[PDB]
Design an enzyme around this catalytic site. Structure first.
Site, mmCIF file in Angstrom:
data_model
loop_
_atom_site.group_PDB
_atom_site.id
_atom_site.type_symbol
_atom_site.label_atom_id
_atom_site.label_comp_id
_atom_site.label_asym_id
_atom_site.label_seq_id
_atom_site.Cartn_x
_atom_site.Cartn_y
_atom_site.Cartn_z
ATOM 1 N N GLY A 13 0.893 -1.053 -0.092
ATOM 2 C CA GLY A 13 0.023 -0.003 0.119
ATOM 3 C C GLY A 13 1.066 1.088 0.124
ATOM 4 O O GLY A 13 2.105 1.198 -0.064
ATOM 5 N N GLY A 16 2.418 1.209 3.978
ATOM 6 C CA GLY A 16 2.876 -0.256 4.281
ATOM 7 C C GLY A 16 2.268 -1.435 3.775
ATOM 8 O O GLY A 16 1.440 -1.317 2.949
ATOM 9 N N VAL A 17 3.086 -2.461 3.929
ATOM 10 C CA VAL A 17 2.730 -3.674 3.144
ATOM 11 C C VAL A 17 1.338 -4.204 3.909
ATOM 12 O O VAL A 17 1.256 -3.951 5.135
ATOM 13 C CB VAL A 17 3.711 -4.934 3.554
ATOM 14 N N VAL A 18 0.421 -4.980 3.020
ATOM 15 C CA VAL A 18 -0.556 -5.304 3.308
ATOM 16 C C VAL A 18 -0.846 -6.778 3.536
ATOM 17 O O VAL A 18 -0.530 -7.474 2.264
ATOM 18 C CB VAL A 18 -1.887 -4.538 2.568
ATOM 19 N N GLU A 74 -11.197 -5.128 7.774
ATOM 20 C CA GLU A 74 -12.305 -5.962 7.223
ATOM 21 C C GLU A 74 -11.503 -6.738 6.163
ATOM 22 O O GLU A 74 -11.027 -5.852 5.363
ATOM 23 C CB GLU A 74 -13.697 -5.613 7.054
ATOM 24 N N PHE A 75 -11.542 -7.877 5.868
ATOM 25 C CA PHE A 75 -11.205 -8.545 4.586
ATOM 26 C C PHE A 75 -12.084 -8.898 3.711
ATOM 27 O O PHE A 75 -13.252 -9.539 3.903
ATOM 28 C CB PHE A 75 -10.234 -9.871 4.973
ATOM 29 N N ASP A 79 -9.994 -7.139 -5.463
ATOM 30 C CA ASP A 79 -9.996 -5.640 -5.670
ATOM 31 C C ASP A 79 -10.317 -5.433 -6.988
ATOM 32 O O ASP A 79 -10.460 -6.191 -7.874
ATOM 33 C CB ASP A 79 -8.472 -4.840 -5.299
ATOM 34 N N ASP A 120 -7.038 9.557 -2.816
ATOM 35 C CA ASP A 120 -6.197 8.598 -3.403
ATOM 36 C C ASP A 120 -6.947 7.603 -3.827
ATOM 37 O O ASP A 120 -6.565 6.181 -3.788
ATOM 38 C CB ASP A 120 -4.923 8.279 -3.011
ATOM 39 N N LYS A 122 -8.503 4.609 -6.329
ATOM 40 C CA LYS A 122 -8.086 4.060 -7.400
ATOM 41 C C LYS A 122 -8.667 2.464 -7.440
ATOM 42 O O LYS A 122 -8.820 2.028 -6.441
ATOM 43 C CB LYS A 122 -6.462 3.955 -7.548
#
Ligand SMILES: CNS(=O)(=O)c1ccc(Nc2nccc(-c3cnc(C)n3C3CC3)n2)cc1
Length: 282
Positions: A13, A16-18, A74-75, A79, A120, A122
């Site tokens: 992201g 940071g990393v997700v 929440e997962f 995307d 942002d 997208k």
């Protein structure tokens, strides 16, 4: 963090990393984001935990330990970018595009009524599930504090406006709307100037007539080339007149003339909106 078992890396992201993770206690599956910490950020993020809406990825927890900040969300399973790539051959059915746009505008209407902006938006931070829902992720993180895409950045931001508004999200969503329809990015710039000039070449170089005050903006140059505007019938072909009408209002140059999320929800384009279920291959 010992309370979580990282399953796999979802992506990298803005901050940071997700990771897709599992709560060692509740057995819950979540999306864990490690931020790369000012007390100002702490409070700002704390407010986001209360901003709940069906079309906003829920911020479950904010873990601030060892001077590090982890955000637990929440997962969802896919995307919009991946979904679009997978639907590239046939394109996302219009009824589904309309539903997604409608739901996203609801999400924005809600956040904007609370004075919170995304900044942002997208395909990558728009998440969908099997039930036909779509949600916005990373909302509000901007205000709190690979090359990032400029494809969805509003013109006022590119021209140096320091105090932009909620209208920057409508712009981004308009760009995403067009991309779902045509199956190609609307303004794929690879530098700020290329982004700006691609916008100009399609919508025409802005001037005092269509955008009062534009020539006095921080990064505006009188030397900007002057391109004429193109018809939307050429820009987003398969889209009907209602769709093109709404899109045009979402892409107005003047932030103050650009349609709001609330007003957009009342646009004629949504008269026959439904909630189809997508074909997701997880
Ligand atoms: C690799 N692309 S993907 O289509 O396979 C995909 C599958 C599952 C996903 N789950 C997510 N849930 C919640 C939140 C996110 C998320 C994604 N990015 C970001 C920056 N986020 C951030 C953490 C708030 N992702 C996502 C992406």
């Amino acid at each position: 963090m010992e309370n979580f078992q990282k399953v796999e890396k979802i992506g990298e992201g803005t901050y940071g990393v997700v990771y897709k993770a599992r709560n060692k206690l509740t057995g819950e599956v979540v999306a864990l984001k490690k931020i790369r910490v000012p007390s100002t950020a702490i409070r700002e993020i704390s407010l986001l935990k209360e901003l709940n809406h069906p079309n906003i990825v829920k911020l479950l927890d904010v873990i601030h330990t060892e001077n590090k900040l982890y955000l637990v969300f929440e997962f969802l399973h896919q995307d919009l970018k991946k979904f679009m790539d997978a639907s590239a051959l046939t394109g996302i059915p219009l009824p589904l595009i309309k539903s997604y746009l409608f739901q996203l505008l609801q999400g924005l209407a809600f956040c904007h009524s609370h004075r919170v902006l995304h900044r942002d938006l997208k395909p990558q931070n728009l998440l969908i599930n099997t039930e036909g829902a779509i949600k916005l992720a990373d909302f509000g993180l901007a205000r709190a504090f690979e090359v990032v895409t400029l494809w969805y950045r509003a013109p006022e931001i590119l021209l140096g406006c320091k105090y932009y508004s909620t209208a920057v999200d409508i712009w981004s969503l308009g760009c995403i709307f067009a991309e779902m329809v045509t199956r190609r990015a609307l303004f794929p710039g690879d530098s700020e100037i290329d982004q700006l000039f691609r916008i100009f070449r399609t919508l025409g170089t802005p001037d005092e007539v269509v955008w009062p005050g534009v020539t006095s903006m921080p990064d505006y140059k009188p030397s900007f080339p002057k391109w004429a505007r193109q018809d939307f019938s050429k820009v987003v072909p398969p889209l009907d007149e209602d769709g093109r009408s709404l899109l045009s209002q979402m892409l107005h140059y003047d932030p103050n003339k650009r349609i709001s999320a609330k007003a957009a929800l009342a646009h004629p384009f949504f008269q026959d909106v439904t909630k189809p279920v997508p074909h997701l291959r997880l």
